[PDB]
Design a protein around this ligand. Sequence first.
Ligand SMILES: *[C@@H]1O[C@H](CO)[C@@H](O[C@@H]2O[C@H](CO)[C@@H](O)[C@H](O)[C@@H]2O)[C@H](O)[C@H]1NC(C)=O
Ligand SMILES: *[C@@H]1O[C@H](CO)[C@@H](O)[C@H](O)[C@H]1NC(C)=O
Ligand SMILES: [Mg+2]
Ligand SMILES: [Mg+2]
Ligand SMILES: [Mg+2]
Ligand SMILES: [Mg+2]
Ligand SMILES: [Mg+2]
Ligand SMILES: [Mg+2]
Length: 575
Amino acid sequence: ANTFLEEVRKGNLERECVEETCSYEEAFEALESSTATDVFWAKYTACETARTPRDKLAACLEGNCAEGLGTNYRGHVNITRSGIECQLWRSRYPHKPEINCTTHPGADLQENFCRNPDSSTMGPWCYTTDPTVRRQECSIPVCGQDQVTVAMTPRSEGSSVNLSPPLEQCVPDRGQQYQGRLAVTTHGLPCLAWASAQAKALSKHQDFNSAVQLVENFCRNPDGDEEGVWCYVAGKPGDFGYCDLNYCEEAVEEETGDRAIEGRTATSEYQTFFNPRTFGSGEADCGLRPLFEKKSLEDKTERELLESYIDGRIVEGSDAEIGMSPWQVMLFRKSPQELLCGASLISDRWVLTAAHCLLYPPWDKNFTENDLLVRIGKHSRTRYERNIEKISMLEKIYIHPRYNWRENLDRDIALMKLKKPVAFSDYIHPVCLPDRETAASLLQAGYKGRVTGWGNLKETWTCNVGKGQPSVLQVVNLPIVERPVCKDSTRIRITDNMFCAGYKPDEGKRGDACEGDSGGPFVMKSPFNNRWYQMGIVSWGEGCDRDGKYGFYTHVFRLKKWIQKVIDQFGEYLE
Ligand SMILES: *[C@@H]1O[C@H](CO)[C@@H](O[C@@H]2O[C@H](CO)[C@@H](O)[C@H](O)[C@@H]2O)[C@H](O)[C@H]1NC(C)=O
Ligand SMILES: *[C@@H]1O[C@H](CO)[C@@H](O)[C@H](O)[C@H]1NC(C)=O
Ligand SMILES: [Mg+2]
Ligand SMILES: [Mg+2]
Ligand SMILES: [Mg+2]
Ligand SMILES: [Mg+2]
Ligand SMILES: [Mg+2]
Ligand SMILES: [Mg+2]
């Protein structure tokens, strides 16, 4: 209904098919459309208990009501029955759909609206954003009626006189300066006693500052980690999981307390905080690319690190240079052959990888020590490079029980273990890591963040037609973004736990904030030591899924002594 000629047949359609009735070969007569016959047919047959009349039908073909069960619906509402965002059809976050993003266009599986594209087992539905629950039915009215399918529930928010109420007030000095009486964890395990028969044994060479007593069995922090509190627990040689509590915003980006000049003459002003035997090497021998840093040759992207230099523009995807991201891991699948996720090479014998792409029972996923393999030093994802890469079998996984896929990616931080030692090389070289007093001072000055990969993050979350995975390694720069800026962009609640980093977005475009890999290298070159310190883990973000948004990455300056307690276990488990 737009031009003169094509509107003429509107009256023809109305008479024969609607009021009276029609068939396929009758329709193909004065309609003149080989494909559009089937669209009508799908919409017509969907009106099951809606043959006649026009007043009672009205909007069954117009697609804004629900009859019988309701396979006619094409209408426009963001939300479902309760109050949860309907996911976009051809997007796949959180839960991946059983019907794919190609086979069936009949019900028109695109954009953030409800449908019924197979058979109504309950009602017409959309996929939830809430990663706990799977599906939920949308309460559309009935054609030629005022009646609703399912009741509405808004889900309130409370504090003053709603909860209980509790008003406990803050904890300073990351749980060193605190006393209490707790007995709970994330999943829920009873904490063991310190002075009894399973704790006192494993304590014969490590750092202490005993300002406090040893208090019975409670979640404590003597060794002085910047995170929280944990207790010992039972099982098949059991692990340690952190007891969860509420915390205040410690301005890690703007730390308060009472052009600039460059450093150069210094090889390494590093901390030897671990003991290379169980933990393995790569504390001293890291952050020193043999091809760039040792030979002392600037890459192209060292002359454009400052936010001050040429103000700012949208920087396009890059084809990387030869061997300029030796820190890289490419985690595959055994049967069938399938690239899954990414990891960051941290030592000669440790693998910091993503946790989301590991344990996720909405995808049916308990693939453990047998069904995995990692590959280091890969430029061509397509080809095989027998020498400059090589194969690396896996050993035990370790969990960080704060890890909550169920809620909102709280700590996407886990660890793997290789069996052999990966030998060092001209192509292969692990990356270093900084602590609180080193990391926080870097982002006082406006220094960019680097990410490399192949867009593994992009492909794993959205089906997304237009652009695809290249053979060549990606590489890209990202400036810094303020705290309340990123907070007032999105309405959904976030924390300092993670952080925001992207460019100034467009109106009519996706953007270039969805590159890299999932659990890949987020690094930054040092101006002091001519070194490379890793300060990020790539997980899910609003920069990919949504438009007009920045990529969302996890912080890593916490959990320093978490690894120190893990390396104790490797010695006793063997033999
Ligand atoms: C449904 O989802 C829409 C996604 O774009 C949003 O609509 C917006 O509506 C506002 C009106 O204040 C416009 O300013 C804006 O251009 C956009 O169209 C919005 O998240 C949501 N809208 C409603 C009404 O629920
Ligand atoms: C995976 O399977 C093992 C084998 O029985 C089971 O014991 C375990 O509970 C599963 N893994 C996890 C993390 O629950
Ligand atoms: Mg008529
Ligand atoms: Mg006829
Ligand atoms: Mg005919
Ligand atoms: Mg005919
Ligand atoms: Mg006819
Ligand atoms: Mg004809």
